[PDB]
A = this chain, B = another copy of it.
Amino acid sequence: SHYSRKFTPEIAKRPKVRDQEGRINYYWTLLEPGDTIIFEANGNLIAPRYA
């Protein structure tokens, strides 16, 4: 109810990092009590398991 943004995973070869070229960006947020968070996705998610 206060946070929203749109993720388009760009594609690009990047230097070796741990002998594995792809990367993620981790994100995070806080929910006040009474707030509902919605995870709309179509591809390239790393869904939460331990909030």
**Chain A residues proximal to chain B, CB less than 8 Å:** 1, 4, 6, 10, 12-15, 17, 35-36, 38, 40
Q: Could you list some 5 contacts between A and B, CB below 8 A?
A: A1-B14, A1-B15, A6-B10, A14-B38, A15-B38
Q: Within the complex, what minimum Cβ distance (angstroms) separates A33 from chain B?
A: 14
B36 touching A15 by the CB < 8 A rule? yes
Task: Please name the residue on chain B nearest to A12 by beta carbon.
Answer: B40
Task: State A30–B20 Cα separation when bound (angstroms).
Answer: 23
Q: Within the complex, what minimum Cβ distance (angstroms) separates A26 from chain B?
A: 14
B17 touching A12 by the CB < 8 A rule? no
Task: State A36–B14 Cα separation when bound (angstroms).
Answer: 9
